[PDB]
Symmetry: D2
Subunit: 295 residues, 4 copies
């Protein structure tokens, strides 16, 4: 009920000097809801969580909750490779009034499966909010196995879902076995959200939704209805965009696309770049025209 | 023509390692009876690497004879040697095959231009439809959608792909580069479900050797657009898909068939006629789950 | 002269409660110097930088400098995937009196090569200290190319070296071409420190040196002397240890080994675990006996 | 003079070219060019010869051609250096046939690749190499190359083979993981013959205990490669690094595209050799690749 459909991994707009642009962020969230987004993820990876201060992280979560006004669930990014920091970020989001938590697998320090279990257990015990595990080997290197995931689901009632960015669709099937058919599985990959739902997924936490919220929402709606022929038609319309925004970092592809369609600021924080290669920008332009978002 | 559940047929051997022609014929006949929509003789799962040229030719001919035009025969004609690939392609054409399955050259690691040259040479040599068999997990090299698109434009008889990348976004990229009419068949049993959601129209399948009826019904559900039913089949078949591939698929399959149909487990070295106890236990459990064993 | 030989990537010992054990750290550093270590890296990955607060990071750097007493160079860990944070950490270490900085490639957020250039350029311009680039694709996923590295070396006089944890020894040869023969190359992999120096390396920033500082120092001394036959004898003695301490995370393998030889506390911070598998502990035990560090 | 080793037993070391197989314009084996290449390799200081390995285009040769080139190599070598015949296949029966032919023809050893494409288990690898080793009396060098075969023979499997078969004597190790040399010393012994299967890391490979390299670059620069290996045998690693400085651009350039094609281009420039290869390899290269090879040849002193 809460975790379904098209859920944007919201960008964090900045002003020219790199400061958080609260006006632009609020306007983006308002527009997302109006266009049919089924949920919101503030201050995740695509919201540039790595370069935000604790105060900025807190404020954007609070602002997202305020703008949403209980219309759609707010699933706050509360990730860290430091368990104590993850708990600290999780507790704030609970106090601020978030509906759920998105918790990434620890990156860089490369814990064991038992370390992953201990990390997520400690977060789950510290809060009452529902938790969605964010398994992303392409970023974190480590990979939570279906066995570890199943163990966490059994041990903690508030571990309710996964944002699965493995890109291995057989993992959805394996997770159905280890975690149950009721376990909430959301795609962490825009380009395979289609196949992901065919395997049992019920939505996607999406980067592309930042650019094309209506099309992404209708795409997800088609799959919920069991209309996969229509879903494939949406894939035909959207795939060039999915591909183009990820030629370089998704944050930067997304902010470029929105700079063209909506006059959004391209500013990001280092080590991300406010610029893109010409072939990337050309592909994004062509993809926007193909999707009907530009002329 | 080329659609649905298409078994990547095993080649049964007798105890001494010789091709068991009668066991092969019975296997093909049963496959057709159970609803398989096409046949791939002497591909990877048919142990093409360990068959002689004479054996390869004989098994292709037998498959054609047993099929009796009921379902298409898509003959394995792969090699990392272009000249050899052409020879196998020409034989299969002369024997009366309906199409050719042509693997990307393995081991020698050609460039994209080398892949283009290889497939162009095969396509120019025969009139039969060709299905490109792109399998980076075995061949290392990976035919890009751009190279694939160039081949499709250049040769009218390059009609499809058996896509074993396991990257479902590649189906979408191949729709763009090769067209929506390009025939895409899954080369991975466990993701055949998502593959068809992305535009695929079937699967060249190892699991179909063991469960041809369930695999055919699974594919039929997807053709009908009934993806809820397809997922129910996935629930039933996934343990088998996983278990068959814990060790090499040929060996997992021949073990499963030894339990259900009294098939010989014999394979040719470097494949092994044996499996680990845990693999056999997992296959046993999967067969029970699928309703193929009590 | 500064950066050479056996340079331990120092562990940060904790008490049972998880607080920094300053006394144990001081004793560890003093022993390292006594046993022949040629330099020191405090608060790097193996020092559990991800789970240390800014204050703790600061204190341990300051502590390392004081105990060292200018006997060997202190190369302070100052890594982050946030450029602003990397600068802050680098500035403190400089203020504290560090001799150099070890700066990791940004992890998790996956910048482009141009993003890597921007990140390291920003750190280099902010400080006067020499900087060693820490290129570790197994942790950061991104991989600084020899071309990007060479561009940084040309642009900034204070970018002087690399801790190369690629495990691809041909990269040393490529880095000699792009960065010059005088560019300081230090192995980031204990098990291939031998081949690394044969290719032109001049030392190793080492996890194993925490456990066997004398053997590691003598090993490096043999290679400086050009005595590769002797260096291979040390490899025979040390390889089982190199392998065993990395069966599970190196921090945890190292702290177990030190618990056996020196009575070190095994405590680490989550998501790292204070425990190991029985097979790992048995392998470390066997390796210590083989090395002559236990009976 | 002849090769003798004062263990009359059984010596494979130094710079050992993975010999190309020259073709005429029509793609037929050029026996004249092959013989001339072998003769020149020996004259320039190569310490052994591998005919019809991967770089000799074994995948595109017929059985007859494979046999002929092996025999020709043995004939031309005339016992001056060891001939380690390529006898690889992913079909065990075929590997045995090739092994037996090489023995009867007078080869000194076999180079036997891990089965590619069919992806056997570790136990399958053991069975494959055991069957080959039991069939012949020749020394066998295991060719472990995960970048081509995908499968990777573990040090444990390798050690088990060494224990089971006295004629399994060495490895051509193309893992590119130098810690594997150290692990193979543990599992197979310090006397196990380890030869680098990667030109660019032959330097570090010997530092870890290797005693030579089965080499693509040696086709182009046999004298420099032999002197490079001699420096390492003498323990002169500073000199070896000077050779690496001289040769690394060539190691890199010839592998920008397939090594067979990089090598045949280089030899077309230095010695007028034919660039012809058999499909799916291409007789052509990208302009930037050729330019890089040209620059590398000049740097090495092989072209003006």
């Amino acid at each position: 009920k809460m975790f379904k459909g098209s859920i944007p991994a919201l960008i964090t707009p900045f002003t020219d000097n790199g400061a958080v642009d609260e006006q632009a962020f609020a306007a983006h969230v308002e527009w997302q809801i109006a266009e049919g987004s089924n949920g919101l993820v503030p201050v995740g990876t695509t919201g540039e969580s790595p370069t935000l201060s604790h105060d900025e992280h807190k404020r954007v979560v609070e602002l997202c909750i305020e703008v949403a006004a209980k219309r759609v669930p707010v699933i706050a990014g509360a990730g860290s490779n430091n368990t104590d920091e993850a708990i600290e970020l999780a507790l704030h989001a609970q106090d601020a009034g978030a509906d759920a938590l998105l918790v990434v697998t620890p990156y860089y320090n490369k814990p064991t499966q038992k370390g992953l279990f201990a990390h997520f257990s400690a977060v789950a015990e510290a809060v009452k909010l529902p938790i969605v595990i964010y398994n992303i080997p392409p970023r974190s290197v480590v990979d939570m196995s279906p066995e570890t995931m199943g163990a966490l689901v059994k041990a903690h009632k508030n571990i309710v879902g996964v944002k699965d960015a493995t890109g291995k669709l057989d993992r959805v099937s394996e997770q159905r076995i280890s975690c149950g058919k009721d376990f909430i599985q959301l795609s962490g990959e825009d380009s395979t959200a289609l196949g992901f739902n065919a395997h049992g997924g019920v939505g996607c936490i999406s980067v592309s939704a930042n650019v094309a919220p209506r099309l992404c929402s209708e795409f997800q709606a088609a799959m919920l209805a069991g209309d996969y022929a229509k879903a494939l038609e949406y894939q035909d319309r959207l795939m060039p965009l999915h591909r183009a925004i990820f030629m370089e970092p998704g944050v930067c592809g997304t902010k470029y696309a929105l700079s063209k369609t909506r006059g959004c600021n391209r500013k990001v924080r280092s080590p991300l770049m406010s610029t893109l290669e010409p072939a990337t920008e050309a592909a994004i332009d062509a993809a926007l025209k193909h999707a009907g978002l530009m002329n």
